[PDB]
From a paper:
Three different classes of enzymes are well established: ATP-dependent phosphotransferases (O-phosphorylation, APH), ATP-dependent nucleotidyltransferases (O-nucleotidylation, ANT), and acetyl coenzyme A (CoA)-dependent N-acetyl-transferases (N-acetylation, AAC). Here, we present the crystal structures of an AAC(2′) from M. smegmatis [AAC(2′)-Id] in its apo-form and AAC(2′)-Id complexed with CoA and different aminoglycosides (gentamicin, sisomicin, neomycin, and paromomycin).
In the sisomicin-CoA-AAC(2′)-Id complex structure, the overall interaction mode of sisomicin is identical to that of gentamicin, except for an additional hydrogen bond formed between the main chain carbonyl group of Asp54 and the second amino group on ring I of sisomicin. However, three ring-containing aminoglycosides (4,6-disubstituted aminoglycosides: gentamicin and sisomicin) bind toward the β8–β9 loop region and make several interactions with this loop, whereas four ring-containing aminoglycosides (4,5-disubstituted aminoglycosides: neomycin and paromomycin) bind toward the α1–α2 loop region and make several interactions with it. It is thought that three ring-containing-aminoglycosides form additional hydrophobic interactions with the β8–β9 loop as well as the β5–α4 loop. Unlike sisomicin, gentamicin contains methyl groups connected to the 6′ and amine group in ring I. The methyl group of 6′ forms a hydrophobic interaction with F42 and F55, and the other methyl group connected to the amine group interacts with the D59 backbone and probably influence the shift of the 45–53 loop region toward gentamicin and cover the active site. Consistent with this observation, the turnover rate of AAC(2′)-Id for gentamicin is slower than that for sisomicin. Our biochemical analysis revealed that AAC(2′)-Id can bind to various aminoglycoside antibiotic substrates, with a strong preference for sisomicin.
Residue numbers in the entry:
A (entry chain B): 16 to 43, 54 to 210
B (entry chain A): 15 to 43, 50 to 210
Write the structure that this text describes.
């Protein structure tokens, strides 16, 4: 099982519609906004006989972290969205293949990987070496400043790959994402 | 005719990345480079357009994903998915022969295929080229969404921005006289 990696702009609209239908069904809670969040980066795709059986995406965002010394960091983040395997093909390494391709993008292009894991996905990320975030989560809003996202506490994983020299993340500290509509994480 | 290759940052060999950075720095040339380490860093994370000829990188550009914050004339805020154009450059001795056009042709294919809006901050030099390709001059005040103050004006970026509205949400009126705000990053916000 190997995933193809393709930019959103190189994806035909029928394959985009097909990936979106496969992802909605795999979550059936996956909304229009959740799909919009998966656009603009690299998709990992696995098909069988022109049926999409696995998908994931990694999109560029800024993750804001303030160290104990008070210095702010706006990290180039590869954010993992719309990871899904068709129900009948689960427990066969398709998830592993999707994440191998998305982590290739994260390690090659970003300072840090981040995602907000569904309950069923948690064991996957733990086994791949992703760090659980235990500190409080927030979003930088345009009109209210930093606003706590308590519904997202205890859901975050990070993959520090190329942090600025001398920066080590304390996972008990606050972490902030950039503003978007729908679920910020 | 040269056609630019589109390559994600993650697919570039470190030797190719170092070469592209050195080519772009030289293209923008004091001992203080106009094109800085932060400017190169801003070009990372998205799709590069590369033109190579006989072992020389002769042209580069990149488009990276950002959020562009815009409040419409009805009071409603939008966080648009933006293809932001960085590090566009042609080696000096190859300028005026359509390489810059070929780079922007490739980057615009990315923007139109993946984003709601394109945006860039142009050298006063390059304003005619963007106007001719159908980019719109931003006339209103520019700002940056900071994590410690709120939206902070960026007056050094005023009358530098161009946008390419490719796929705005239904009923969004884009008025270029209004404020526009970028997401926060170190170095030049625009
Ligand atoms: C999450 C999901 C994509 C995983 O797909 P999958 O095909 O079941 O996953 P895989 O078989 O590739 O297994 C992924 C890895 O997790 C491991 N794993 C799975 N369940 C595990 C568990 N309970 N404990 C430890 N490891 C576990 C597997 O061993 C595998 O690692 P390995 O290849 O090293 O053995 C799938 O359950 C799904 O689509 N769910 C619905 C949509 C969803 O919630 N997605 C959220 C994405 S964050
Ligand atoms: C700006 C730059 C990328 C243009 O690339 P180029 O290959 O020289 O330009 P092209 O030949 O593709 O011409 C595209 C347009 O640029 C303009 N232009 C800019 N410099 C030009 C030059 N030296 N000769 C001819 N046209 C030039 C022309 O208006 C042209 O439109 P036209 O072909 O319809 O006449 C390039 O000259 C450069 O690297 N300069 C450094 C500044 C910079 O990097 N800006 C990037 C975005 S702000
Ligand atoms: C309360 N604790 C948590 C609970 O809130 C929830 O976390 C959500 C998480 O899945 C969401 O992301 C996944 O789901 C979808 C579809 N919605 C799209 C992308 C997927 N990566 C994220 N966008 C928002 C999180 N809040 O599940 C895990 C949890 C531990 O139970
Ligand atoms: C106030 N006057 C303005 C003046 O500040 C300047 O704008 C700058 C613009 O070039 C910069 O982008 C270019 O340069 C570099 C290297 N630095 C990288 C990518 C290039 N697209 C942008 N990052 C910041 C802008 N402030 O030129 C236009 C102007 C109107 O004259």
């Amino acid at each position: 099982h190997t995933a193809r990696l393709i930019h959103t702009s190189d994806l035909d609209q029928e394959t985009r519609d097909g990936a979106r239908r496969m992802v909605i069904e795999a979550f059936r809670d996956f909304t229009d906004d959740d799909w919009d969040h998966a656009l603009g980066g690299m998709h990992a795709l696995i098909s069988h006989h022109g049926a999409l059986i696995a998908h994931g995406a990694v999109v560029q965002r800024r993750l804001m972290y303030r160290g104990p010394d008070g210095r702010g960091h706006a990290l180039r983040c590869g954010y993992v969205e719309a990871v899904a395997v068709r129900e009948d093909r689960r427990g066969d390494g398709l998830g592993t293949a999707v994440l191998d391709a998305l982590e290739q993008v994260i390690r090659g292009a970003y300072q840090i990987g981040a995602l907000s894991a569904s309950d069923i996905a948690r064991p996957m990320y733990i086994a791949r070496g992703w760090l659980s975030w235990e500190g409080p989560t927030s979003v930088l809003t345009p009109t209210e400043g930093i606003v706590r996202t308590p519904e997202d506490d205890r859901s975050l994983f990070v993959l520090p790959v190329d942090l600025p020299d001398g920066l080590e993340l304390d996972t008990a500290r606050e972490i902030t994402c950039d503003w978007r509509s729908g679920d910020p994480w």
